[PDB]
Write a protein that holds these residues in place. Structure first.
Motif, mmCIF file in Angstrom:
data_model
loop_
_atom_site.group_PDB
_atom_site.id
_atom_site.type_symbol
_atom_site.label_atom_id
_atom_site.label_comp_id
_atom_site.label_asym_id
_atom_site.label_seq_id
_atom_site.Cartn_x
_atom_site.Cartn_y
_atom_site.Cartn_z
ATOM 1 N N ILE A 209 -8.813 -9.498 -14.141
ATOM 2 C CA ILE A 209 -8.946 -9.865 -12.761
ATOM 3 C C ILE A 209 -7.652 -9.486 -12.050
ATOM 4 O O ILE A 209 -6.538 -9.941 -12.437
ATOM 5 N N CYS A 210 -7.807 -8.659 -11.015
ATOM 6 C CA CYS A 210 -6.703 -8.384 -10.120
ATOM 7 C C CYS A 210 -6.679 -9.309 -8.922
ATOM 8 O O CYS A 210 -7.508 -9.152 -7.996
ATOM 9 N N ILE A 211 -5.724 -10.255 -8.945
ATOM 10 C CA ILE A 211 -5.533 -11.170 -7.825
ATOM 11 C C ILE A 211 -4.619 -10.585 -6.752
ATOM 12 O O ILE A 211 -3.445 -10.386 -6.984
ATOM 13 N N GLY A 212 -5.192 -10.290 -5.578
ATOM 14 C CA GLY A 212 -4.454 -9.730 -4.455
ATOM 15 C C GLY A 212 -4.537 -8.220 -4.270
ATOM 16 O O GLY A 212 -4.824 -7.439 -5.204
ATOM 17 N N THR A 213 -4.246 -7.802 -3.053
ATOM 18 C CA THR A 213 -4.293 -6.410 -2.700
ATOM 19 C C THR A 213 -3.304 -5.559 -3.505
ATOM 20 O O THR A 213 -3.586 -4.381 -3.788
ATOM 21 N N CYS A 214 -2.157 -6.156 -3.848
ATOM 22 C CA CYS A 214 -1.155 -5.461 -4.651
ATOM 23 C C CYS A 214 -1.671 -4.964 -6.002
ATOM 24 O O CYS A 214 -1.614 -3.760 -6.252
ATOM 25 N N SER A 215 -2.178 -5.870 -6.849
ATOM 26 C CA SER A 215 -2.695 -5.517 -8.153
ATOM 27 C C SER A 215 -3.933 -4.652 -8.040
ATOM 28 O O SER A 215 -4.091 -3.678 -8.787
ATOM 29 N N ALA A 216 -4.825 -5.013 -7.110
ATOM 30 C CA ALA A 216 -6.094 -4.316 -6.911
ATOM 31 C C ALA A 216 -5.896 -2.854 -6.486
ATOM 32 O O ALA A 216 -6.513 -1.979 -7.066
ATOM 33 N N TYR A 217 -5.027 -2.609 -5.494
ATOM 34 C CA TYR A 217 -4.972 -1.333 -4.810
ATOM 35 C C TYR A 217 -3.573 -0.788 -4.632
ATOM 36 O O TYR A 217 -3.404 0.318 -4.138
ATOM 37 N N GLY A 218 -2.559 -1.547 -5.009
ATOM 38 C CA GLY A 218 -1.172 -1.074 -4.860
ATOM 39 C C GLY A 218 -0.377 -1.912 -3.872
ATOM 40 O O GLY A 218 0.778 -2.307 -4.141
ATOM 41 N N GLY A 219 -0.980 -2.194 -2.726
ATOM 42 C CA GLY A 219 -0.373 -3.146 -1.787
ATOM 43 C C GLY A 219 0.952 -2.736 -1.143
ATOM 44 O O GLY A 219 1.287 -1.547 -1.040
ATOM 45 N N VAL A 220 1.717 -3.725 -0.725
ATOM 46 C CA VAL A 220 2.844 -3.488 0.183
ATOM 47 C C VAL A 220 3.909 -2.499 -0.316
ATOM 48 O O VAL A 220 4.412 -1.716 0.455
ATOM 49 N N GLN A 221 4.287 -2.571 -1.592
ATOM 50 C CA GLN A 221 5.292 -1.644 -2.126
ATOM 51 C C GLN A 221 4.758 -0.232 -2.236
ATOM 52 O O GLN A 221 5.544 0.665 -2.452
ATOM 53 N N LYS A 222 3.446 -0.025 -2.106
ATOM 54 C CA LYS A 222 2.871 1.321 -2.194
ATOM 55 C C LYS A 222 2.764 1.987 -0.825
ATOM 56 O O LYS A 222 2.506 3.198 -0.726
ATOM 57 N N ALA A 223 2.958 1.199 0.239
ATOM 58 C CA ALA A 223 2.984 1.749 1.587
ATOM 59 C C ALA A 223 4.004 2.919 1.728
ATOM 60 O O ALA A 223 5.064 2.907 1.119
ATOM 61 N N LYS A 224 3.686 3.917 2.533
ATOM 62 C CA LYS A 224 4.602 5.022 2.767
ATOM 63 C C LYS A 224 6.011 4.564 3.117
ATOM 64 O O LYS A 224 6.166 3.652 3.934
ATOM 65 N N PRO A 225 7.038 5.224 2.521
ATOM 66 C CA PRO A 225 6.895 6.420 1.647
ATOM 67 C C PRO A 225 6.840 6.092 0.142
ATOM 68 O O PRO A 225 7.228 6.914 -0.685
#
Ligand code: SF4
Ligand code: SF4
Ligand code: FCO
Ligand code: F3S
Ligand SMILES: [Mg+2]
Ligand code: NI
Lengths: 262, 544
Positions: free
Chosen positions: A107-123
């Motif tokens: 189980i991925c809890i939160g947008t971060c684990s699920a999709y990458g989230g805030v630290q994955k934002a550009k750049p």
């Protein structure tokens, strides 16, 4: 003395908001959950053990005879061989990969684990990834920044007692993410009549007019916020603010500028 | 005396659990005392980099995600920051609402910290099983207000629940706890263990209510969504019914603070009086919070009801003004590029350069913030000493209350025990001011509902947002060029407290505070945890 199912919870690139969201649960309260429903066998935020004692507890849960479920909070930083995110001297990717290998489910809890989230934002300086991308494994995604505890605990309970719930294209359970925020918005009659706040100080804003012209991403976000509320009392649009689309993959880049549509 | 082994050698504790984020602590020990230390932050995310080129309006939404424990505070700091850069004065109602959500945050945060993060360093949960619940109820009826949650009946149900849990064989979060089988650093009688554990479980429910209170004004928790440039969006938050609910919930929370938190805090302190001589530092900084005038950084600094100031070398007779030009960050001993030392945050540079684990030359993802070459402790203790020294009447009363109740001098507050008690102290004072604050906004609201001021985005500007977050002095610093973010820098309380050495090789507050720590048992170095946790570390905050 009935055995409770083992849950290992890892923290990677996260802000700990998902852990905080989780412990806001009221059906049941977190104490009833961890004393009665599951055996929460590793959780860095609240566990008594530190250091080598802690790391052993993890390796005990991972080697447990009855197996375990994996809860992941945070993205995975992958630059320099994962070394920008480390615990006990190991890259997070390494440890998460280890833990995913043998999990009954993830189980991925939160947008971060699920999709990458805030630290994955550009750049994306740390070359952050969501779990399924970093591990190449299917995850049950409970996104939101953070998700409603109702959605997380509901998912967990559903997995332990019923099975894997029906997921959409983005791995989210249709039980909680099947509907647009906008379709359940008490402000929808204003939207339909083209009655929009032009600014936060306007009389229109004061009269609770639709926040679409101030960037509201309600019409493109799947979440159950206005139906279930947060903390039993409120949600953003009720507090006069547009939705940020925080449950949508990569929303930090696709829903920004947050006070616009363009 | 304090239990102390003869161990000589290194100890590494990684992960430090029961904090926000990823911290490794390295210490050298010589005859059972810490002789040297390093505070090594183990995750980098880079929000400052990410913000570059974006809409200044978006900053608060990105920076909020610096930390979900101290949620809100970064949204607040960024809103103040941009408000300052665009030169807008927020409405009085916006000032009141923003300050009340900060108050709600203090209550939620400090409660969770004592019970769920800190208490397990002082309380042996499995000793609670050895307590006779009728004796515990009796001990409780003495050292703490009367309450049905402290009855023998109540206390035996906790004991029963915990007994079934322990005999299950699945210890969950207590697996490998440093207290299993006893530990010479753990002093509490079994009865106090039982009381404190019962309160630990109650606190899990009460924190839910504190967050509900916050969400009334803030829209949701974690991660509030009610602040906008020029003020707030939450016109419902100014009305009768929501404010009545908020009061009700706050009063329930505050009751628990005065019936459980303080008495527990005071009991613990009473048994750990030796900790009044361990973990002291010398310099304190606060930006103040709860200002009556938030029209400018200057006005905030001057009109904060929890006052701002600078204390050096424990000199309570001389509180200086905060010089915001006098702040800078060093990276000599951090994982950043050469050429980054001595930067004022308006000239902040964040250019990550990793080397290797336990590189004594570069050992942390935190920068090292310094104030005129001086490392500064921030947070509840800093605020307490500063308010005390200025004679802020609430702190003066409460501090002397605690001093007299523990029978110790003011100077024993320069310690881990003091750091811990100060957190409790300020929670009690926030509690005492809630109704006053709530009534002021209800009245203000009732009269006029201006909540947001009009503003224009400048082509070019700079601004600073100050807050005293739960963990200490927080600042967000923006440079705007071409109506976009040119530079945005966070300097965060945990950066102040738990950063590495500065350019002169001077230890940070936690590093200094660790020097002299006794270690009863190097296998299970609970003492390291006591001091590090007292600072209430948040590594996601510190590195961002
Ligand atoms: S999804 Fe949001 S609240 Fe959850 S860990 Fe990530 S940034 Fe924090
Ligand atoms: S655009 Fe937003 S405020 Fe407007 S009706 Fe949709 S969800 Fe409600
Ligand atoms: N309180 C808090 Fe979080 C830290 N350190 C911030 O700012
Ligand atoms: S911002 Fe997130 S919490 Fe719901 S209202 Fe919009 S999806
Ligand atoms: Mg910074
Ligand atoms: Ni924080």
């Amino acid at each position: 003395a009935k055995h409770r199912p083992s849950v290992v919870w890892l923290h990677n690139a996260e802000c700990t908001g998902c852990t905080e969201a989780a412990i806001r649960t009221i059906k049941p309260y977190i104490d009833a959950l961890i004393l009665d429903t599951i055996s929460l066998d590793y959780q860095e935020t609240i566990m008594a053990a530190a250091g080598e004692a802690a790391e052993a507890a993890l390796h005990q849960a991972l080697e447990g005879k009855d197996g375990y479920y994996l809860v992941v909070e945070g993205g995975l930083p992958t630059i320099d061989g994962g070394q920008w995110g480390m615990v006990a001297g190991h890259p997070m990717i390494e440890t998460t990969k280890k833990a995913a290998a043998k999990a009954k489910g993830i189980i991925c809890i939160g947008t971060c684990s699920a999709y990458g989230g805030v630290q994955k934002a550009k750049p994306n300086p740390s070359q952050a990834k969501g779990v399924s991308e970093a591990l190449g494994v299917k995850t049950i995604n409970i996104p939101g920044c953070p998700p409603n505890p109702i959605n997380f605990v509901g998912a967990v309970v559903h997995v332990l007692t019923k099975g894997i719930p029906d997921l959409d294209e983005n791995g989210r359970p249709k039980l909680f993410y099947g509907e647009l925020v906008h379709d359940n918005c008490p402000r929808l009659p204003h939207f339909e009549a083209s009655e929009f706040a032009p600014s936060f100080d306007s009389e229109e804003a004061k009269k609770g007019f639709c926040l679409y012209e101030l960037g509201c991403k309600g019409p493109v976000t799947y979440n159950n916020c206005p139906k279930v509320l947060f903390n039993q009392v409120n949600w953003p649009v009720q507090a006069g603010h547009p939705c940020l689309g925080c449950s949508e993959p990569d929303f930090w880049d696709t829903m920004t500028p947050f006070y616009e549509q363009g | 005396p304090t239990p102390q082994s003869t161990f000589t050698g290194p100890i590494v504790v990684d992960p430090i659990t029961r904090i926000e984020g990823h911290l490794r602590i390295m210490v050298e020990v010589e005859n059972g005392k810490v002789k040297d230390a390093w505070s090594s932050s183990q995750l980098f995310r880079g929000l400052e980099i990410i913000l570059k080129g974006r809409d200044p309006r978006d900053a608060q939404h990105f920076t909020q995600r610096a930390c979900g424990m101290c949620t809100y505070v970064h949204a607040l700091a960024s809103s103040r920051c941009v408000d300052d850069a665009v030169k807008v004065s927020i409405p009085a109602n916006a000032r009141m609402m923003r300050n009340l959500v900060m108050a709600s945050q203090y209550l939620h945060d400090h409660l969770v910290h004592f019970y769920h993060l800190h208490a397990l360093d002082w309380v042996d949960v499995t000793a609670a099983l050895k307590a006779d619940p009728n004796k515990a109820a009796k001990l409780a009826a003495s050292i703490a207000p009367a309450r049905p949650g402290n009855s023998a009946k109540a206390l035996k149900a906790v004991q029963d629940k915990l007994k079934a849990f322990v005999e299950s064989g699945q210890l969950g979060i207590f697996t490998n706890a440093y207290f299993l089988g006893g530990h010479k650093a753990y002093y509490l009688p079994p009865e106090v263990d039982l009381i404190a554990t019962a309160h630990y479980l109650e606190a899990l429910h009460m924190q839910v209510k504190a967050a509900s209170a916050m969400a009334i004004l803030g829209g949701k928790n974690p991660h509030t969504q009610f602040t906008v440039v020029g003020g707030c969006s939450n016109y419902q938050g100014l009305t009768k019914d929501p404010l009545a609910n908020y009061l009700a919930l706050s009063k329930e929370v505050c009751q628990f603070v005065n019936e459980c938190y303080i008495p527990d805090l005071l009991a613990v302190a009473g048994f750990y009086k030796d900790w009044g001589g361990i973990g002291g530092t010398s310099n304190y900084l606060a930006f103040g919070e709860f200002a009556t005038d938030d029209s400018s950084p200057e006005k905030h600094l001057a009109t904060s009801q929890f006052p701002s100031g600078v204390i050096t070398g424990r000199d309570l007779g001389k509180v200086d003004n905060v010089d915001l030009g006098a702040i800078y960050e060093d990276v000599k001993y951090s994982w950043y590029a050469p050429g980054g030392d001595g930067k004022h945050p308006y000239d902040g540079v964040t250019d990550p350069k990793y080397t290797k684990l336990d590189d004594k030359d570069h050992y942390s993802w935190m920068k090292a913030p310094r104030y005129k070459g001086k490392a500064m402790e921030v947070g509840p203790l800093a605020r307490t000493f500063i308010a005390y020294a200025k004679g802020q009447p609430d702190f003066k009363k409460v501090v002397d209350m605690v001093l007299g109740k523990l029978s110790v001098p003011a100077t024993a507050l320069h310690s881990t025990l003091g750091r811990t008690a100060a957190r409790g102290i300020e929670t009690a004072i926030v509690c005492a001011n809630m109704e006053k604050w709530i009534k002021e906004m209800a009245d203000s609201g009732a009269k006029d509902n201006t909540l947001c001021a009009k503003w224009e985005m400048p082509e070019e500007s700079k601004g600073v947002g100050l807050a005293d977050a739960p963990r200490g002095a927080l600042s967000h610093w923006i440079r705007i060029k071409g109506k976009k973010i040119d530079n945005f820098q966070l300097v965060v309380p945990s950066t102040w407290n738990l950063g590495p050495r500065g350019a002169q090789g001077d230890k940070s507050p936690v590093e200094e505070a660790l020097i002299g720590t006794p270690i009863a048992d190097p296998k299970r170095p609970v003492e390291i945890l006591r001091t590090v946790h007292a600072f209430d570390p948040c590594i996601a905050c510190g590195v961002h």
